[PDB]
Amino acid sequence: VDPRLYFENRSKFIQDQKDKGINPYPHKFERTISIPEFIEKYKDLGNGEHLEDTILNITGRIMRVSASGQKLRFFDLVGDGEKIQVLANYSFHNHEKGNFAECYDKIRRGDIVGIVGFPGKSKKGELSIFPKETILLSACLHMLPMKYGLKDTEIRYRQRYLDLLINESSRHTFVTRTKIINFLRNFLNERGFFEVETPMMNLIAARPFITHHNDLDLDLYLRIATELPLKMLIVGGIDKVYEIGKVFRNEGIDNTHNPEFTSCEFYWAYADYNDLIKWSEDFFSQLVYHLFGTYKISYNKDGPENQPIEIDFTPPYPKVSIVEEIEKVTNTILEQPFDSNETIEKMINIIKEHKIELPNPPTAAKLLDQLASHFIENKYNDKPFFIVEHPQIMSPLAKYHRTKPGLTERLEMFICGKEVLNAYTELNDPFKQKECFLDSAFCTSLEYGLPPTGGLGLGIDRITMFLTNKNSIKDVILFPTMRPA
Amino acid sequence: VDPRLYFENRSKFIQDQKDKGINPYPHKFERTISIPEFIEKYKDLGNGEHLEDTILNITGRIMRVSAQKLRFFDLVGDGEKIQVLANYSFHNHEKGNFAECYDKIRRGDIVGIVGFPGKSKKGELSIFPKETILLSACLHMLPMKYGLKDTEIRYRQRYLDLLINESSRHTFVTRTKIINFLRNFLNERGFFEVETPMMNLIAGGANARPFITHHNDLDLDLYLRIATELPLKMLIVGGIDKVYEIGKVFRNEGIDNTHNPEFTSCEFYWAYADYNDLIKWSEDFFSQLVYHLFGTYKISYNKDGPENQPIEIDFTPPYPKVSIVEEIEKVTNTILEQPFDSNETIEKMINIIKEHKIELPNPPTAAKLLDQLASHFIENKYNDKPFFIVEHPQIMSPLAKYHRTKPGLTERLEMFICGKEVLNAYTELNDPFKQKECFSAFCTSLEYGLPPTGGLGLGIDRITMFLTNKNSIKDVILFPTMRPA
Ligand SMILES: O=C(NCC1(O)CCC(F)(F)CC1)c1cc(=O)c2cc(F)ccc2o1
Ligand SMILES: O=C(NCC1(O)CCC(F)(F)CC1)c1cc(=O)c2cc(F)ccc2o1
């Protein structure tokens, strides 16, 4: 091919057109209808039917060019993810506005054009615009990749625009993401929740990103969660409150982790465990039904080259008590307290015998996390499920379980072995909140009285992955965090 | 009453309750109605009328303790208020001693009441308890009725502002309604909401130092975005023809009453739109937003603070359009000959600034001089209606398409409310051969073909300030970043 030459020559064309008094980047073309609107309005035409008296102005990007016949030229025109044909017939051209062949020979794949013409269908039944006049609105100076010729993630994740133009499923993925967020926002708002914005950077502060604030001469931390200020709003009497926005984790990158991701966190005064579980079941089932018209979906867990599985979002979903289950499968009691030297040693021994990676550092909470990932988190690939009743030492903001000492009223929901949701009743007794005696501001706010409250957070990117059949978070974030090329 | 001793005694109370087998922070109280729903259901009851057969569970925060045999409180929830009338006559004596129960209650305590609806003889809608449970105690003395004018406290303990100042909750409810109105306005027009990166590889801009941070695993310096403009334009190239984002942008600069280093913007791009379409979108949005909130286009604003008379701002469209160079030349009795960056015109501008005893921008570039002249001579032109400043010079507007009829100018508009910029918009300069930056990821995307496009940005915080009658931007941000205590 030689793309460099293609580009040099198209740049010369631009200059050339300008020499003839043609602006290949003109100011304004007044369109009368969009491509989706045109398809909706004309899709019932009969084969070969022309509405020669209906004159429309339309725009779009040319994505295919062909001819045979100097006097009959055909293009694909795309707009808003939809497509029509352009049938340029010598006889329908306005010859006073220019030479036909000259007008149409200069069009290349990628060009954005403005068409004045009439609607009809080809004898084959393809919905088409029949131009009297076609003008360039903006040129494509590069050779675009061919359809099915853009697989390189280095280009798709950086030059996302090329991915959107060439890979049809890419636009669908990002459409689905926005419909998920719209669904959630509406779901919450119909339940009386009040959306807010809290600060993206905090004084005191998951390993954080740090940034210097010039006006205050302070080094501040990007938020890792929106939890603290939301709870302060509950204290303030906003009894159902939430935020949907970005949080930042200066950690690793992989198929389920990006350094900024979008969370939805809500707090719900006077709610319990049971309300959070029901919320979760209601929300997931109703979202999937909204998107798909069924509770069951297909997901390629092990990639596009292997057979998919079915994930069923029909509620209710299984609940697995983390400690009881670890103890059962390992036939070992993890005696409380879980951070005793003896119980730590026991967890390390189990980890050592199953050749599970020892975490670093090997703290009781991280040991319990590793045990759960090994023995439980992959238990159910065919339905979402909750891991519940986590130890206090894993869950310092969660209220004590009312009948299982040492545990909490916490739930964490997993889809195919990946965490997408964490929720719990908030520990609201300041004399039991060990992290006070945590941002000193939080501690203080508890002393003014936090009602009994339930809190919940969702990972919007991971949810989108499952509902768009993607195996990497990079495929559901328009511009994922990447080093320069 | 001494605040330290008050707190110490409430802490001692908590522990004494626990020592008597009472949990002053119980897990769950199951409420059956909210305070707003209660007011709505029972507001028509005849005086002194009781529905003693309707047993309800209600919760709220006690905000007044009036009150033997008969105890009176104010109970608040969701920004509304009812009376509590606790009568010995109706108390469930099985559950506890009437005076022991009600003697323990203090202003700010959150409580759960089992009781019945009625009005008092005197006419006051009330809940009548049979039983009252502490759900979460206020350990501190709450500031009273007024007496929380202190901005430090309102901004550092926003929860106290929200509990004590009725107008606080209103300000922030209004803010959420503005954003909701905007999202819906856009969505009904076919715009598609996206999230672009908070962290990018662009080291700020000409008038905006960046927040800098660093991802440790990548070993990569990153910068907080100063605007969403670049990725949104790339999505226009990618065929998302009407695209927007509402979220935070970051400029690591000084703080004042109209500038916060983190602030909320909405930016949209609209392919195939012009100048005039952006003017009209602006008049439609502002007028309809104000009508939506107030039921009139005319609002009152204390431009000179609460201690001075307000002015009326009329949002009835259309709004005035003032051409920047023409108006400077008129008010200043000068002619500013192009090019505006000639030593002569620079000299003329510098001398106007000196002679008027206006601070001279440093360095004195043509764009900065023009900026200073507009700010002094034109940005206060109208205070009784919003207005547009239009047709900025190319030299001040390097991403704006050239004006079709006036040499050296652009298709740009900025809207001002009481001398403050709330919107900036223009037709995008899309010929890469005319974009001065293209001697970049921008310039590469322009080479693939950006259609003729209109772009617009709104300052959400400043718009909220005017629609909530605030003079400082910290008044419309829940938790603004403050110099630590
Ligand atoms: O969705 C995710 N996690 C699930 C949640 O923990 C998310 C927060 C919650 F919504 F509150 C509860 C459920 C997630 C996505 C990432 O890209 C990511 C990146 C990191 F560097 C570190 C953690 C990360 O976590
Ligand atoms: O609302 C503001 N400006 C108006 C806009 O320029 C906002 C960006 C646009 F929306 F795209 C077009 C209109 C504003 C608010 C601040 O708090 C602020 C702080 C700074 F450090 C620097 C500039 C700032 O500007």
Numbering used by the authors:
A (entry chain A): 78 to 282, 287 to 518, 535 to 582
B (entry chain B): 78 to 144, 147 to 518, 537 to 582
Sentences from the study reporting this entry:
Aminoacyl-tRNA synthetases catalyze aminoacylation of tRNAs with their cognate amino acids in two stages. First, the amino acid is activated by ATP to yield the AMP-activated amino acid, with loss of pyrophosphate, followed by transfer of the amino acid onto the tRNA. Malaria parasite genomes encode two different lysyl-tRNA synthetases (KRSs) that play a role in translation in either the cytoplasm (PfKRS1) or in the apicoplast (PfKRS2), while Cryptosporidium parasites and humans encode one copy. We present a selective inhibitor of both Plasmodium and Cryptosporidium lysyl-tRNA synthetase capable of clearing parasites from mouse models of malaria and cryptosporidiosis infection.
Addition of fluorines on the 4-position of the cyclohexyl ring in 5 was tolerated and led to excellent metabolic stability, both in mouse and human liver microsomes. The complex of 5 bound to PfKRS1 showed that the addition of the difluoro moiety on the cyclohexyl ring had minimal effect upon the position of the ligand within the binding site with respect to 4, and there was no evidence of protein rearrangement. In this complex, all polar interactions were retained, although the H-bond between the bridge-head OH and the side chain of Glu-500 had shortened to 3.0 Å. Compound 5 was active against both PfKRS1 (IC50 = 0.015 μM) and whole-cell bloodstream P. falciparum 3D7 (EC50 = 0.27 μM) and was selective compared with both the HsKRS (IC50 = 1.8 μM) and HepG2 cells (EC50 = 49 μM). Under our experimental conditions, results showed a linear competitive inhibition vs. ATP with a Ki of 32 nM and a linear uncompetitive inhibition vs. l-lysine with a Ki of 212 nM. These results indicate that compound 5 competes with ATP for the same binding site and only binds in the presence of l-lysine, also suggesting a sequential ordered kinetic mechanism where l-lysine is the first substrate to bind. Molecular dynamics (MD) simulations were successful in reproducing the binding pose and interactions of compound 5 observed in the co-crystal structure of PfKRS1. In addition to those interactions, the inhibitor was found to be stabilized by hydrophobic contacts established between the cyclohexyl moiety and the bound substrate l-lysine. Simulations performed in the absence of l-lysine showed a notable destabilization of compound 5, suggesting a key role of l-lysine in the binding of PfKRS1 inhibitors. In apo-PfKRS1, due to the smaller size of V328 and S344 side chains, the ligand binding pocket remained accessible to compound 5.
